[PDB]
Amino acid sequence: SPLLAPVRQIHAFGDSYSDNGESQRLTREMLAKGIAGAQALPGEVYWQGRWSNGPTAVEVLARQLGAQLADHAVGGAKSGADNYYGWMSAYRHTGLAGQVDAYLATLDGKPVDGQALHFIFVSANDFFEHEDFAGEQPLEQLAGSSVANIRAAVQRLGEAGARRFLVVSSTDLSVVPAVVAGNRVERAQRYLQAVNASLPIQLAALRKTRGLELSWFDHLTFSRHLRRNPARYGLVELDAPCQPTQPSVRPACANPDQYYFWDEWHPTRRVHQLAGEAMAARYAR
């Protein structure tokens, strides 16, 4: 199958797996304004506003493709309007649907770039918020909502003029250290299988109806290759965070590039690099 056409501009939408500074900017604005419950995100033990110790995967992807990046993703973002952090809603809707809305409002009349790649990577916070705040919805129904929400984002961007998309699957929530510690490995498996079975069917139907260029990145296949043969990728430690934060911050491991996880939820820069390189692989430079 032929490589897809080159990419010169990316518009990225999603959560802390893509965020390159928005949760930092937004939370300082929320702190300055006095919004109740606001905290400085991501925190002290993170690199330059990323929720990791280096560039996120979409930033690597942009580098790999020779593209410029406008990264609208916000740490904590859910697939609908709002954030894992409920207190942000008093200031901005920073979920995927919020990000789409702000991107389209910020065009200032001008058209959508029909050549820009619209990059969508979200859903983990749907599961985390459900599990952390005792959500009552069955997981299959939550998965349904996540899927609807993502499809609706692509439909809305398409309606406004976007033509090119890369949508990332659920990551393997089942091996995230926070999920292991919460004894929630089976819930994560069931959730991520339901999103990843359904989403690509919905996206294929939309891609055909609206004549889109839509690529699907299966992040679970990707992390299964990394975790089955880690020495091949220079990785040694697959389960412990390099930078513990929970219950409290402790000293970082000395060899973070041999680690899969930076904190209890987020991958290291080395995993982000590998993912961004893999994501670039269906596109011509």
Ligand X SMILES: CCC(=O)SCC[N+](C)(C)C
Give residues in contact with ligand X (CB under 6 A).
Answer: 15-17, 51, 75-76, 84, 124-125, 128, 265
CB of 209 to ligand X, least distance (A): 30
Task: Pick between residue 130 and residue 164 the one whose CB is nearest to ligand X.
Answer: 130
Contacts of 194 (CB under 8 A, 6+ apart): 139, 140, 143, 144
Beta carbons of 74 and 49 less than 8 angstroms apart: no
Specify the residue, 51 or 103, whose C-beta has the smaller distance to ligand X.
51
Minimum distance, C-beta of residue 85 to ligand X, in the bound complex (Å):
7
Give the three-state DSSP class for 88: helix
Which of 129/283 has CB closer to ligand X? Answer: 129
Structure tokens belonging to residue 165? 């998309």
Tokens of 276: 């961004």
Nearest distance, CB of residue 254 and ligand X, angstroms: 24
CA 244 to chain centre: 21
Per-residue DSSP letters for 147-202?
HHHHHHHHHHHHHHT--EEEEE----GGG-HHHHHTT-HHHHHHHHHHHHHHHHHH
Q: Which residues pair with 53 in a beta bridge?
A: none
* Residue 22 or 62 with smaller CB distance to ligand X: 22
Least distance to ligand X from the beta carbon of 30, Å?
15
For ligand X, the closer CB: 15 or 172: 15
Are 214 and 200 within 8 A, CB to CB? Answer: no
Distance in Å, CB of 118 to ligand X, minimum:
19
Between 133 and 254, CB nearer to ligand X: 133
Token representation of residue 270: 């080395």
Q: Where are the beta strands (DSSP E) in the chain?
A: 9-14, 68-71, 117-121, 164-168, 213-217, 237-241, 259-261
Nearest approach, Cβ of residue 42 and ligand X (Å): 8
* Distance from the Cα of residue 1 to its chain's centroid: 27
Q: How far apart are CA 195 and CA 246, in angstroms?
A: 28
Residue 85 or 283: the one with the smaller Cβ distance to ligand X is 85
* Distance of closest approach, residue 26 Cβ to ligand X, in angstroms: 13
